[PDB]
Structure formats: structure tokens, C-alpha cells
Design a protein around this ligand. Sequence first.
Ligand code: 88C
Ligand code: IHP
Length: 1416
Amino acid sequence: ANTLVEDVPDDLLQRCVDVCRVQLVHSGTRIRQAFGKLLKSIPLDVVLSNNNHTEIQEISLALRSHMSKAPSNTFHPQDFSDVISFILYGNSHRTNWLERLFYSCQRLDKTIPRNLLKTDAVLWQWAIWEAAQFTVLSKLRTPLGRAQDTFQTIEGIIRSLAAHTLNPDQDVSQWTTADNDEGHGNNQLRLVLLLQYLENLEKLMYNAYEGCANALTSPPKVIRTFFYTNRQTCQDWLTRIRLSIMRVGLLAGQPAVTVRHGFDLLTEMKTNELEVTIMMVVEALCELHCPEAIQGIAVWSSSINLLWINSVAQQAEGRFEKASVEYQEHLCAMTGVDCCISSFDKSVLTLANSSPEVINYLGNKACECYISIADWAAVQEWQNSIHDLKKSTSSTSLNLKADFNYIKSLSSFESGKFVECTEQLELLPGENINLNMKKLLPNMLSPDPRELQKSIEVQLLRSSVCLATALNWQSITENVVKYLKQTSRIAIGPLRLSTLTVSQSLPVLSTLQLYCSSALENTVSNRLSTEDCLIPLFSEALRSCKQHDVRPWMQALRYTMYQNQLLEKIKEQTVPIRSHLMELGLTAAKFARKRGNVSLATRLLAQCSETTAQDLVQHFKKWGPELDIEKTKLLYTAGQSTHAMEMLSSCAISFCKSVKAEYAVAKSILTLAKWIQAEWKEISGQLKQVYRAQHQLSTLSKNILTLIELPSIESESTVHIGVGEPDFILGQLYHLSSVQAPEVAKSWAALASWAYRWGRKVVDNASXXXXXXXXXXXXXXXXXXXXXXXXXXXXXXXXXXXXXXXXXXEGVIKVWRKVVDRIFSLYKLSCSAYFTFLKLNAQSTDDMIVMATLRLLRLLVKHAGELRQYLEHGLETTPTAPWRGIIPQLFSRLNHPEVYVRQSICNLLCRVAQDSPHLILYPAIVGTIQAMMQDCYSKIVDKLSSANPTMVLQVQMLVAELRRVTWDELWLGVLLQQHMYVLXXXXXXXXXXXXXXXXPHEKWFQDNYGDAIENALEKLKXXXXXXXXXXXXXXXXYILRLEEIAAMTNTEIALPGEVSARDTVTIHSVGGTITILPTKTKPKKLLFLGSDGKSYPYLFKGLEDLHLDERIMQFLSIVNTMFATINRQETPRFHARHYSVTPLGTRSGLIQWVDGATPLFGLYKRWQQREAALQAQKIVPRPSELYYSKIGPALKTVGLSLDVSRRDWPLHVMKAVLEELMEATPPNLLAKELWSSCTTPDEWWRVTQSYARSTAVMSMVGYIIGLGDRHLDNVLIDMTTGEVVHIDYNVCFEKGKSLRVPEKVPFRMTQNIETALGVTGVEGVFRLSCEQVLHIMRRGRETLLTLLEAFVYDPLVDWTASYAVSVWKRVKAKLEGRDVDPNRRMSVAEQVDYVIKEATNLDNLAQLYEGWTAWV
Ligand SMILES: CCN(CC)S(=O)(=O)c1cc(Nc2nccc(-c3ccnc(-c4ccc(NC(=O)NC)cc4)c3)n2)ccc1Cl
Ligand SMILES: O=P(O)(O)O[C@H]1[C@H](OP(=O)(O)O)[C@H](OP(=O)(O)O)[C@H](OP(=O)(O)O)[C@@H](OP(=O)(O)O)[C@H]1OP(=O)(O)O
């Protein structure tokens, strides 16, 4: 709070990082220098994390608010001239000038936060937008010349930049030359500003000739008229320069600009530049790390030779070996001659994971790919192969654009040779080697970030060699310190540029280079005496940086190894670097193995331990255990599963006798169990052999036998019924892992899951001492009959006694108890393990805990008397924290036909009340308003009131007032119903009851219509009813007052629904006014004022049940919980937006209001209004009148009439009408709306990806659940983050198929919805996201089915408002993959394709309700 003002744990570290990022670009140099040091002191595991940054979000919102505002027109021509002069020439002609310009442009007569006025990024963005506004509002009559002069100016500059990009030897003036180190950074800044200006200009022109909807204000009539007649020229110019814009964007390291331009160019090609365009777009996507988009483009282009695109996608995923091999194969097949080089075995590498320009691109990609993994030998061999191929084919164009001198220098440096390294470095450009500091970068340097990175690396190498030679303290140290300081000052440029635009992430290469420079600067001055000289890249990044490549690890290792070797030249005490080196090498090896890089992984393992499959088994078979586990994993990834399993077993045997062996034993056992489960068919024999040997062999079997037989529960008697022999080994392994590490929750969860899955089947199928006991207690056929009756199907005691008496004609009780106890042993063990796992979580995923709680509840509900001593005692000590996700389920089970069960549930709820009463307050209070379901609620309310009785009394009064605020409406409804059914005793009774029920607002209503009783009495012995109804209807034709319809203040009651709130916000006030919406049943839109001064709107609904909506929301939350793991290594989060609903009785209810979401129908309405205005220049029809206007003549043409039923309607006529309607509406509504709402191309890419992922997740959820009536008004969109939200949920669970006009599409997928996903459509990120969502749902379908089953058996849920059983069966069939055919089970890909085809075909869209508006 103290920081980021006008005056000059991981949770706190994240905020600190965001603050430092925002302050990185500040007007004052002292602030930037101060925050840079703080940023450098934060570990990379937090700096490179994918957490959200609210600081950048504030700037984005401020900019969005400024653009959405109406134009100011205060920008003078001189300001624009100065801005353009600085952008195109570097001279600003003004000597904190941005702030002065902004202040001068503002007007007092006619709202960016003041604290944000000190950031240069905000000022630059504002200036660029203002300049674009001035250029557009002036009809292109800027001081740069005429309307065409500007076009030629920017066109020439862009063409020159593109030419330089193709040939780096052009050296364009004013762009590649600088007088010092500041000019070089200014060049990149100017280039970025130019790209932003072009994007803004295009957006403004589009808005001028077409228009937006609630995003940007419409320009004057003159501007619209001028841009409408000249849109063709603008479009032609943009299309002509789009080819060069992409190249310029690629040179500036801004893949978003080139990606957007490429998509637009591809879309415009509606009728030899296609290959280059596709290749360039693929390159940009690869730079953005988006393999899904590349795959989608490849599939899209396959319908128009381009099989190499998929290969590039592999490189975008982090796989370098496979990518290089594929590139070589493609080049060999395209050229006609052999071009492959020596590498790892293809059979193992694959198992682990014709134009002159295409060949050059593939060769360059292969070279860069080999350089990324730091394979100098491979690079040299590749160079020789390329030279030989070029000489044997006379290509004359196949050249590698990679500085070989730099590669040789790096090779010599990493090889320990410093003399040769210095000799090679002497030939590189830049300042000479240390023996002037303000100008270190050389001249003629291009603005490409790659060149800057190369220069920084060269400087670092020069400093390292200088220090090494100087070592063998103020002689050769001051110069090195100054050199390193300047190097660190130059490497901060990329971070500032990244912060200039809303990126939400920082460059990895630049950050690593900056940290390396800082480490070198600290080690030179301290001579390796402080812990600050080491790179902060620790192993903690394993669980927080899974979305990055292995490149940063190699960069860090490059200097870590150098420091390690340099340690031998220091005699004084030094810090321990061996541990850091081991940690870095191990983590890098893990990252490499997780992507198929077997060669690099083996190299790292060999380095830490100090091309054939048989070589690995002969070279590998505090960090000890981790190293062994990594070796086993590497061997497994190479295909040698047998050797890997044997090594793991051998390592676990030794770990079982170690000192600590806490986290290593559990990992070595769980991994082995998982691998054994994978190859169940090939390990069944070995497991059976082990089991047979246990009661009386391969190396793995003999090694596992000693592991399970390790001296210090599961007996062979309890598993001798329906349990297979190989499964016993897995159970024993889980038990061993649990007893060997009681502090690991996974060791208990695995055992509990195994025990439960086996016990369920054992009890289901079950529905020598025993014989001896029965014979002794009953001192031939009689014995057999008694034995069979005792265990026949074990009000049960009476039935068993009667059966035994009828068969034989008392010691059978003991035998029955023993057998029932033996059959349920699995459940007892599972319950104990689950209780221990829950107690250890007072470290695991939320879903992992929800499943356990649901299983325990299901067991206690189904089997209560069979296992009571376990659950009764466990529930009395289980913590209340992991039981906050199934509260409604606990309340719904308060009527179980059991005494102790209800008592235990009540006790658990009471315990949960303490320290968390804001979660079970509303349900209990509402429930209190037979005796089995009443005493529980009364006791819970009393227990909750024992702490704060005032809060309970106040909440009760509030609930009563809300219920009483749900008179005129009731009278009008009753009168209408009576009049409709008029055409007696029933009417008289109803009128009397209504009058009796009616006995501020009430006083006025009575004083105004108190003659109703007299009129009814007089008419009893009928115009009075009609007159009253007419008067009520006339007076009905919205705004109320809380005071007149009491109002409390300073309350201490929690808000209506705060499950996801660590600190509850007590209600402070209530809205003074209430609005009534016109959507069907009259709803009351109220507002609440919390303690935190925030405003929370709510929608109060009456006379309708809302218990199903709560269950649906809970199900959605449970589903969203399953995406916690996948969201830790993916930029676009997998989320399902949903609100909260809280019923207030049988027919009342309160629903949370979601702000910031705009319905999709608004865009169509605005477009219709714009079209109508345009047509009138030289209301709008409803979705029902317009449809009939076309269905009338069409039906009359064939001979039919409109009087015919909709069922007997030709399909061709409907298809023709639908096609005619689709050709009128344009598909650029949502696509252009989202584009205009964003601020920068980088933000546009993020918004588009988020929208695609959200749409895919929502579509899959709706299809699985069965959501219907998905019209435009029922779908909302969040433009700030581009997310899809759904509100209405009345039509669900396949209810739409039984309506008057059935629906066949599973989800809504129309022209605009599909067009907003990109040029590819549903073949890119959409299909992959849908497949991933289905995979996740299929993996965790057990918990979903259990939750649905619990929802079915709910006395407070009204389904008809065996239907529930049918719904559950349908959901189960859909989740299992047997929705279309129950005999064959389709795969995830097949199901996704079938659903997409069914939702995208025109046959189903033609026959649909006109209200769904399928033509948009
Ligand atoms: C352009 C006009 N609008 C769109 C229609 S809007 O309403 O004005 C509007 C709404 C929001 N945001 C928002 N947030 C939360 C909820 C709702 C909402 C709205 C209406 N109905 C429900 C509803 C009704 C019934 C049931 N349940 C059953 O039917 N049976 C059990 C469940 C839910 C929920 N809306 C944002 C902007 C705008 Cl414009
Ligand atoms: O070996 P680690 O580096 O510790 O990573 C493993 C494992 O990675 P591997 O697939 O390479 O074996 C899995 O990580 P992801 O695949 O999800 O990225 C994950 O679980 P899965 O194997 O089911 O995917 C989990 O292993 P576990 O199943 O035991 O939770 C994890 O860390 P741990 O092995 O330490 O738990």
C-alpha cells in the first residue's frame, strides 16, 4: 500500500513482483534503479510463475475506460507532429514531457488515476491512441501531407524494414544505428510504438466505416460518410501492406501482430503467397508456444504438400530431438538425396515421444533446434551435411543464418579452454576484450531481440574469460565491475518493453540473462563469498514452471559450471556450489526427460554422476535417491521398462533401510505400482508367481517378494472371496507404502481407494473354523443346510432365525457376526485409511478430498449397522475443514431411518458451526421455517445461537421480512385465474380465503381498494371481479422503496452465499430502492452493502422452486475443482463461470447477480439498428416476424399454406430459408467486438485464447449435463477477460427434446460463435480443449455419478417441476461413451467429432425454434 503512491511467503512475493514490474517503467530513474534491485532478489520460481497480476490489470482497465469514452478532440497538430517525429526519426523536439503533454491536453470543463500518471507505459499508450484518433478524425489530413502521402510514408518505412529483415545487410538509417546504448533500446521502443499505432489506426477505420456495439462511441456523420465511400481503398491498402507488416512484426519480436495480420490475410483470401503466409504464421505461433493453433492450421490447410507443419508443432511443444529428425526426413524426401545425420535411434526416439523457401526454412529450423539443446557436435555435423547437399544440388539459396564463430566460442568456453575461447571472441563484433563504458554495443546493430541476446551473451563470456585470466583486489576488478554493471543495465530493456504492453508474463531468456549478469557481478566483487552470487533457479520451479522449455536451465548451467571450475582458483572460504550444481543438473534432466530429449537427458545424468538402447542399461544400471529415481525414469522412457522396474525395486529395497527415507520410499513405491498397473497383462504371471511363492522366479518377482516381506493388516482370509491373486500384491504394496511413510497423504489415499473399489465388488458379489464351530455348537445334510443358510445372503436377524428354524427343523449368532465382520473388513480398512488421510489434511487436491468425503457419506448412509464402531468414533474427531464441500448432502440426509446416524450428522454439523457459522446459517434458518427433520434443525439453530444469539435473531427477522416482501400481485393473479376458470362454491371459497389472508404499502392498498370485500359479498347472492381485475391490470403498467415495503443497519450477518470467502463480509445496509424486471415472473432486483463498502446486487424470485439450481451450481463447482492440476501449467485457465443461488423456502429464492457480462443478443440488436439507419439514410423486426416474412412465400411456392402444422413442413424449404437468412447477417459481430474491446495485440491473443477455451469447456459441460434453450439472451460474455457465462438453467437434463419444438443440437454453435474462434474454426484449440475436458471428465466420472445419485435422493428437490433414474442413466451413458450406441464405446476423439458434426450440420439447425435465432 505504501508503494505506488504519488509521493516519491509466495502470496506477498507475487504482489511484490507485480509492483516491481509496474514500477520498472517510471519517470524517475531512482525509482527504477531501486525496484530493479528488489526484483533481482526474488527467486525465478516466483518471477516466472503464471500467477495473475492485478497491477497490470488496473492499467488495462484504465486504458479501456479511456478508449471507450467519447473522443475529446483536444490533440493539436503539433503534438501529433512531435509524436510522429519521435517514432519515425527518434527526435522528440521537447526537453517528464509526456506528463506535461497529457496535462495540457486535458480540460477542466469537460479520468485516469493520478497514481498511474507516473508510468511511462500508460502515457505512451494514451499518446498513441490520441494520435490515432486525431489522424482518423482529420480524414487522414495530417501534417505529413495529403491523405495518400501518409500511406506512402508508412508504406515505405514498412517496406524498408521488411527488406532489412530479409537481408540483414541493408542497415536501414534511423533504425539500426545508435550513438550509445540508449539509442539501441529506443529503436526497439519506437518500432513497438509504430506497430501499436498501425493497429489502432486499423481499429479506428473499421469503427468509422462499420461501427461497434457499446465498446466505442460512433464517430460523427461526416466521418462515417467519408469512410463509408472510401472503405475499398483502405481495405486494398491494408491488404497490400499486410505481407510486409508480418515481417516487421516478426523482426520486432511481437508475434501477436503478425499472427493477427496473417489470420486477416487468410480470411480475406476468399477467392504463390499462400505458402509463405502459412509458413510465417506457423513460425509466429511457434514463437508464442501455441502448438494447438499450429495443428489447427495444418488440418485447415490439408483441405486446400503441407505435411511439415505438424513437425513444427512438435518444436513448439518443447520436443527438439523429434523435431530435428522430422525436419531431416522432410528435407530428404523433398530434395531426393540423403540428408540425414548421425543421431539417436529413431525406433527409440519416436517411442519416447518443394519450394526454394521451404527447404531453407526447414534447414534453419533444424539448425536452431540443434543449437537450443546445446549440441555443438551435432551443429558441426549438420553444417557439413548442408554444405555437401548444397554443393551436390547447386541450391544457391540453402544457407544457414547462424553465426558459426559465436557457436565455436560457446563450444570452447563450455569445454574449459579459455585461450581458444579468447582467440575466437577476438573476431566477434563489439568492444574489445577487457585489459568506453557508456557505449558497449556496436554500431549497425539491428533492432531484433536475438541480436541483443547474442551481444549480451558475448559480453558475459568476455567478462568471464577476463576474470578467469586475472585470477591466475583492485587491479583487474574495477573494470570488470563497471563492465558487468553496464551489461546489467542493458539487459533490463526487454523487461521494460514487456511491461509497456499488457503481457501478464516476462521473457524467460531476458530474465535469465539478467540474473546471470547479476550473479557474475556479485561473484567478481565478492570472490564467491556470499550466497547472492548463485542463480536463484531452484528445484521449486518444478511444480510452478512446467510450461517453459529446458533452455533457461542450460543457460544457467553454462555459468554454474564455470563458477564451479573457477572455485579451484580460490584459497579463502567459499560458498558450496556443488549442491547448487547437482540441483540444477537434476532439475534440468527431469525437464528434458519430460519432453522426449533422451540425448540431452543422458548427457545431464552423466554430468551429474561424474546412441543405442543397450548402452543405457549398461551405463546406468542428499541427492542420491532422487538421482536413482531419475535414472530409472530415464530408462523407462527409452523403452526398457523391465530394467527400469528392476532398478526401482532394488533402490526401494535400500531406501527401506535408510535413515530418513520419508519422501523417497513413497515415490519409489508409487511409481513402481503405477508402472506395474500399466503392464498388467505382461506382469500378471509374475504377480501370480509371487503370490504362490508366498505360500510354499524372475528377478523382478524375487526382488518384490523381499520388499513385501519386509519386517515391521490385510489377511489372505478377507481377500479369498472374489479377489484376484495379482491384485493382492498391489494391495500389499499400498499398505507397505502407507506404513513406511505415515506423513504422506498419497500413501493413504491409494490404499483407501484400492480397499474401497475391492470391498464394493466383494460385498456386491457376496449378496475352516466356521464349520468346526458350527459342528461343536450343534452337537450329514443338516450340517450342509445350516452352513448354506448361515452364509446365504449375509430385519435380518429375524429372517435368518426363521430360515434356520425352517431348515434344521443358539450359536449361529456368533457365526453370522464373524462372517459379516470378515466380509466388511475391506470397508473398515478403507474407512480407517480415509479418516487418516482426512486428518492429515486438516497437501492434496480439493477433488481428492471431496471424493473421500462422498465415499464416507455413501458408506454411512448405505451400510450403517454393519460398520458402526468405525464411523461413530471417526466422525467425533474428524476436522471440520475438509467437510465444507458436502454440507447440502449432509443436510439432505437428516431423515435417514436411523437414530445414531442422525445424531452423528447433527453433531458434525454443530461442530462445523463453530469457527464457520456463516456456511450453515441460511440453510438451517430456512429449514426451521416431521419431527425427524425438525428437531435436528432446532438443535442446530440453538447451538448456533449459543454463541451470538443477536445474529440469529436478526437473520430470522430478515428472512421473515424477505418472505413477507414477496399483495396486489397475488390479488391480480387470483382474479385472473378465477376469471379464466369462471366458465360457484369453489370461487366463493377461494375469494373468502384470499380476503382473509389480506386482512405502509398495505395501508395505502387497503385505503384505495377496500371495497373489494363488500363488492364480493354483494355479488355472492359478477361485474365486480371484472372491474377489479381491469383496475389492477391498468395500475400495473416497477420501482419500489424499501422503507415503504424493516430496514436495518450495522448488521453482523454474513452475505447470502460466501463459500469461497476466507474473511466473511457482514451485511452493512440494504438498497433503498428495488427494481422489477419484465422477464416473465416479476423479479425483484435488490442490492446489498457489505462491511467492505462493496456493492453486491441480487435477484429475488418468488413462487418458483430453486432447489435444483443450487445442486447444479454445486456440480459445476465440483467439476471446476478437477481443473486445479491442469491449470498449473497452462496459460488459458480451464474454468466454468457460475453464480450462486440460495433458496428461501419452497417457492422463494435469491440469486447472485453477475456484473460485467453482456448478452449476445445486444450485438445483433445493435447491428439491426445500424443496418436500419443506414438503409433509411440512403423498431427492428423480431426473431419471429422476420422468420415468418420468409417462411410464408416459401411455403406458398410449393403449394402448402401457413395453416399446416409445423410438423408437416418440407425440409428443403426450411433449409432454403435458413440459408437465405444466414447470408444476410454477417459473422464479424463477436469477432470484431472482442478485437475492438482489447487494447493491444498481445492482449487480443490472450482474450481470444481464453474465449476459445471457455467456449469449449462450457460446450462440453452443457452437452454432458444436457443444457437447453441456449438462446442469445441466455449467453453472456465477459469482454474484460473474454469468458462465456450461462444464467438460465430451467431447461436441462434433456428437457428440450420434449418441448413443442424439439432441439437436436447438443450445444449452441452458430456462424458467429464459430467465426469468433479464428480462421481455423473448430479444428484448432477448440477441438483439443474439448478432448482434454472430456478426458478429465472421464477420469473422474465416479465422483460425478455419486454426486448426481445424491441429488436424485433429495427430498427437497422437485424433479417434476422414475424420471430421476432415467436422467441419471442418461448422464452415465454419456460419460461412459455409449450415448449413440450402447454396444460400442466411442473414444474421446470420436465423441468430440460426432458432437461437433451434429451441432454444426445445417439439417438440424433448419428445424429449430425461431426464438433460438440459428441465423447468428
Ligand atoms: C438483456 C436482458 N438480460 C438477460 C436475460 S438481464 O437479465 O437484464 C442481465 C443479466 C445479467 N446477469 C445475471 N447474473 C445472474 C443471473 C442472471 C439471471 C437473469 C435472468 N434469469 C435468471 C434465472 C431465472 C430462472 C432460473 N431458474 C428456473 O427457471 N427454474 C428453477 C435461474 C436463473 C438469472 N443474470 C447481466 C446483464 C444483463 Cl443485461
Ligand atoms: O516424477 P515427477 O517429476 O515427480 O512428476 C510426477 C509425474 O511425472 P511423470 O509423468 O513424468 O512420471 C506426474 O506429473 P505429470 O505427468 O502430471 O506432469 C504426476 O502424476 P501422473 O504420473 O499421474 O501424471 C505426479 O506423479 P503422481 O501420480 O505420483 O502424483 C508427479 O509428481 P510425484 O510423482 O512426486 O507425485
